[PDB]
């Protein structure tokens, strides 16, 4: 029973939908459809500025917690890597803020916001590598305490941040809820005596880097695809029609996102580490399937109930100026249950590890997503981007069953 | 592409002299908007000129124009004009006028660009 987990979700859920609304109430779609792009760098942040080890580092924690000597080598090497890519990341953000402003938001006026992120970004690494540290020693409860407190005062930040600093204090204020965990994480590590603070010196152990290096490969191909697809697809959208099209579509996937996360609890925790047990192929297809007979009619069933109160949905988690995303809901939810279907397939490649075939999803998503969108932007606007990733995802769900079973019979 | 804006003026102009600019707006409710002027050189950001409030028609100026320029609003004709005095050379650069909504802009953020999302195609000033 891991209440910790499902509690600390909830009120994460909770704030997003808090700080979603008031970004849409006070911003209106063009604030919506313009901090999508900084939004999404912020998740890549999430996944990638502690060189993204944090799962490698849970994994191995767990395998050495009882061998004093290789669990100090452990987290040493994780601090190592997390320190030296935060000052690269420190470096890139301050020397190309204009740039990364170009790609995001199509206007260097952001320069100061990204440049501001690298020193956010470092609360981002560390924060990350300490719940990570409080997740291998089984501290559920320290995590999700801190989970708890950091995004209570990430409330508290972002709004005292939009207040004084307007639309880019709302985009610094997304930048400080999941930076700000440093603090609650660093006092509960420390003060619950969890482990000493002898063993965060970083020091280098070149066979637990290369391991934890595969966990940085992977976190790397998960950001240089699917993340720059959304990004060019905002960009081309708010190129033909406006900023505020890019919050009509971003309001329908912002609302999809409160289910889909609380759906998703249900795959790392009980999934994961089923698949990496098991071995024998007749074993492997009955927890494909069995999963698949639960969260497919668990993810149909909420988008069927959120398409039936689609009209209070946008009056409730957003504004009624967000009242055109109403046709857009159905072309959406078909293309969620399609996601999480093939989640369950990814799942499996998380398991084997295999850079291969985890390459290959994110590439396959990323091609399906861009010629969709280039044949549907132009023509249909933001619903031509839902009818995109409908569309995508319709392909790939059914590409991955193919590649299943042809992987069942050893292709 | 809600509220469009249109520069219109501006050019060559010798030390000491004046120039008007002026800008259009083809959107609805032009009154309850934040309007400003941003400048940009080539190679630099986008700096703050001045602005209008949607109140009362409250104005703020840079350190660097204030008392030289001059910004006004007309919401039944949805322009603003920027009345530009006295011109240092320094003052060569692509004028942008911007609109946002006063929840943009904040209680600090008033001068920073990237709190104005609608712009327009900006208007050449040259100080001989």
């Known amino acids: 029973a891991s209440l910790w987990t499902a509690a600390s979700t909830l009120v994460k859920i909770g704030a997003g939908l808090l700080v979603g609304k008031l970004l849409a109430v006070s911003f209106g779609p063009a604030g919506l459809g313009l901090a999508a792009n900084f939004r999404q760098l912020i998740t890549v942040l999430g996944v990638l500025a502690g060189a993204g080890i944090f799962n490698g580092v849970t994994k191995y924690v767990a395998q050495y917690h009882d061998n004093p000597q290789q669990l100090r080598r452990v987290v040493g090497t994780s601090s190592a890597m997390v320190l030296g890519f935060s000052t690269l990341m420190a470096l890139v953000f301050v020397l190309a803020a204009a740039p990364i402003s170009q790609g995001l938001f199509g206007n260097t006026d952001y320069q100061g916001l990204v440049r501001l992120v690298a020193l956010v970004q470092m609360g981002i690494a560390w924060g990350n590598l300490l719940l990570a540290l409080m997740k291998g020693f089984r501290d559920a409860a320290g995590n999700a305490l801190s989970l708890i407190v950091g995004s209570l005062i990430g409330v508290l930040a972002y709004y005292v941040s939009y207040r004084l600093g307007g639309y880019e204090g709302a985009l610094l204020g997304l930048a400080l809820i999941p930076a700000l965990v440093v603090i609650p994480a660093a006092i509960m590590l420390i003060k619950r005596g969890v482990i000493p603070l002898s063993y965060l010196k970083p020091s280098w152990d070149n066979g637990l880097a290369g391991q934890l290096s595969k966990f940085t490969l992977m976190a790397l191909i998960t950001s240089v695809t699917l993340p720059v697809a959304y990004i060019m697809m905002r960009k081309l959208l708010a190129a033909q029609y406006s900023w505020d099209e890019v919050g009509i579509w971003q309001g329908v996937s912002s609302i999809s996102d409160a289910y889909l996360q609380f759906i998703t609890a249900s795959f790392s925790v009980y999934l994961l580490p089923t698949l990496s047990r098991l071995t024998e192929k007749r074993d492997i297809t009955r927890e494909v399937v069995k999963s698949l007979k639960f969260v497919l009619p668990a993810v149909a069933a909420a988008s069927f109930t959120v398409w039936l109160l689609r009209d209070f949905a946008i009056w409730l988690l957003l504004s009624n100026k967000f009242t055109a995303m109403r046709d857009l809901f159905a072309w959406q939810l078909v293309g969620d249950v399609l996601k999480v279907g093939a989640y369950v397939f990814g799942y499996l490649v998380i398991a084997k590890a295999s850079l291969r075939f985890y390459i290959l999803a994110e590439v396959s998503q990323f091609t399906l997503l861009m010629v969709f969108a280039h044949w549907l932007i132009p023509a249909h606007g933001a619903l031509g981007a839902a009818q995109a990733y409908m569309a995508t995802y319709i392909v790939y769900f059914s590409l991955c069953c193919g590649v299943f079973l042809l992987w069942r019979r050893r292709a | 592409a809600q509220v469009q804006l249109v520069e219109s003026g501006g050019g060559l102009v010798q030390a000491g002299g004046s120039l008007g600019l002026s800008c259009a707006a083809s959107?609805?409710?032009?009154?309850?908007?934040?309007m400003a002027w941003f400048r940009q050189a080539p190679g630099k950001e986008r700096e703050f000129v001045a602005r209008?409030?949607?109140?009362?028609?409250?104005?703020d100026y840079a350190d660097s124009v204030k008392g030289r320029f001059t910004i006004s609003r007309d919401n039944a004709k949805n322009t603003i004009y920027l009345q530009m005095n006295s011109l240092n050379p320094g003052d060569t650069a692509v004028y942008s006028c911007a609109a946002t909504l006063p929840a943009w802009t904040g209680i600090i953020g008033g001068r920073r660009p990237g709190n104005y999302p609608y712009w327009g195609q900006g208007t050449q000033v040259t100080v001989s």
């Open positions: 209008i409030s949607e109140s009362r028609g409250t104005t």
């Open positions: 959107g609805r409710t032009f009154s309850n908007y934040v």
